Design a protein around this nucleic acid. Structure first.
Ligand SMILES: CCNc1cc2oc3c/c(=[NH+]/CC)c(C)cc-3c(-c3ccccc3C(=O)OCC)c2cc1C
Ligand SMILES: CCNc1cc2oc3c/c(=[NH+]/CC)c(C)cc-3c(-c3ccccc3C(=O)OCC)c2cc1C
Lengths: 277, 277
DNA sequence: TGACCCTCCCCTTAGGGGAGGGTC
DNA sequence: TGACCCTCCCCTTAGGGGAGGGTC
């Protein structure tokens, strides 16, 4: 071959855009063998096309362009090693996605349950599967003064293990025949965990524990101040009327119904307490 | 809570950079509840922090920011569906990586073999595993006039199934006791395939076939014009001397030793021909 | 006074999409 | 004359890193 291909010809032959070729030229990754000193037209030799092989392959596996420059200088012995590295980075991506895929599925599972709920505003008993959680003591906090900020450390922690930060906020309190909200004080506030990912060195002010599998007397509803205490009361009454035995704190879970800064915020609230008989 | 968090406070609480908050502000994704009309300082309410939950989660799974705007307007019923979509896109990514991971491994396998080679310039017989390939007739082409461009359609095709374009170039020719290069003409030129990926509607001028598993008389060496024909001759002689029976065309494979536009190009050449006795 | 916050401004990666003007 | 090619120039995404100057 003693001619020359024009940019368009290379483009059509190698299945690479003309823009790409001009760019690889500027980058000094793949430069035409000859540039007409007047028209500036780019001209390529046939033998030179071989170099687009490595470039197109590396582009396919995501290698950044500047990285390619040092990959072409390596050499069949080291290129083998180079690939070994790309592999390790690929399995890294894979592991990440698999984990991610598992998490999304769990979020969806829990998300679906809050949609299958028997009825709102009514107490009912059901067999629950366990729920892993991370908690910390409430230090004075109660329904009237809890803040999103109160969950900062817990969230920082779960975020580090799940990536997918928590959706629901939890709190617990002693099952008592309260007569007023102000009488209530939280024992712990918690956020459920979604991963069995070996917790990133948990500090001792946090406790990894669980809302155990068992029978629970529950009530769920869409939050409204003049409903919070009444639903609690329905739970208290329900348990007293059928003489049930409470064997846990009252578990309280709050989950936003939407995250739109545009519409009036609304929350789903759920109170459950484990029972025996 | 009847105060206000400053940008720095939100940053520390939600584990999101200050720059990020300013940006989410500009984008109109997450805007502070209040902006001091004089200092321009941004101020946020505690209740508002809840919105960073969805945002941080979507950012974790790769959802583009502008996409988030429409995700917050959706609503626990549709958000479920939204996640289902993200899942489908995640498995898409996974499948891609797995395939990619398999390919890289095969490239490495073949790449290693050409490094384990017994010796260069010497004929030797070995048991080969099959090699899938895609070929087309050579139409007159021979060792003296083959061009990289000659492989354009074949490459376009393999690229579509492997992503990782071919590394080696092949050709075949009738086993004859040639006395000169010019007497040689290729029957087919081919590129090996690396994927069992249902070939993207192959046209009939191409043939999916194989260099079959079997015993081959081979010779590999680093290309040099005044060596090409001599090595062929060593093969011819080797086969005649031990009276072997040839049962295939001569398979010729060329692979660049490096893809550096900076150093003198060099190639590994390999000729193999299947035999019986 | 230190921290804290704000508004530019430049910069990163891999080209795609023109617009205006030559060029086999 | 159509195709073909070239050189700007603007633009995309998600902020990070300052620089210069106010601000609890
Ligand atoms: C077990 C999960 N724990 C939580 C429990 C909560 O119980 C609350 C009871 C109330 N009771 C009246 C008797 C009122 C007024 C607000 C409450 C908030 C609240 C705080 C700040 C801004 C908005 C809200 C808010 O509107 O939250 C919806 C529950 C709240 C928040 C969390 C995290
Ligand atoms: C089975 C694979 N098929 C191929 C076989 C080939 O055999 C060749 C034999 C030769 N023999 C002299 C008797 C010479 C001179 C060049 C050859 C080239 C070649 C063509 C253009 C630019 C550089 C080279 C080049 O330098 O290629 C290295 C082989 C070549 C290319 C391919 C794809």
């Amino acid at each position: 071959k003693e001619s020359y291909y024009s940019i368009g010809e290379v483009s059509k032959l190698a299945n690479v855009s003309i823009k790409a070729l001009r760019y690889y030229d500027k980058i000094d990754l793949f430069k035409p063998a000859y540039v007409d000193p007047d028209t500036s037209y780019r001209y390529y030799t046939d033998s030179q096309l071989i170099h687009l092989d490595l470039i197109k392959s590396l582009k396919y596996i995501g290698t950044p362009l500047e990285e390619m420059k040092k990959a072409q200088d390596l050499e069949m012995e080291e290129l083998f090693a180079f690939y070994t590295e790309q592999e390790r980075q690929i399995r890294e991506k894979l592991d990440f996605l698999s984990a991610l895929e598992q998490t999304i599925s769990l979020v969806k599972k829990r998300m679906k349950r809050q949609m299958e709920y028997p009825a709102l505003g009514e107490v009912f008993v059901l067999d629950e599967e366990e729920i892993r959680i991370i908690q910390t003591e409430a230090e004075g906090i109660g329904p009237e003064n809890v803040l999103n900020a109160s969950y900062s450390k817990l969230k920082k922690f779960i975020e580090s293990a799940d990536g997918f930060t928590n959706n629901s906020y939890g709190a617990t309190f002693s099952f008592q025949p309260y007569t007023s909200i102000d009488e209530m004080t939280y024992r712990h506030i918690f956020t459920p965990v979604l991963t069995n990912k070996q917790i990133s060195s948990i500090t001792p002010d946090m406790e990894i524990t669980t809302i155990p599998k068992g029978r629970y007397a529950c009530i769920a509803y869409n939050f409204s101040p003049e409903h919070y205490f009444l639903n609690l009361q329905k739970l208290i009454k329900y348990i007293a009327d059928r003489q049930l035995t409470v064997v846990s704190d009252v578990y309280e879970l709050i989950i936003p119904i939407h995250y739109s800064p545009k519409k009036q915020e609304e929350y789903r609230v759920e109170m459950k307490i484990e029972i025996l008989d």
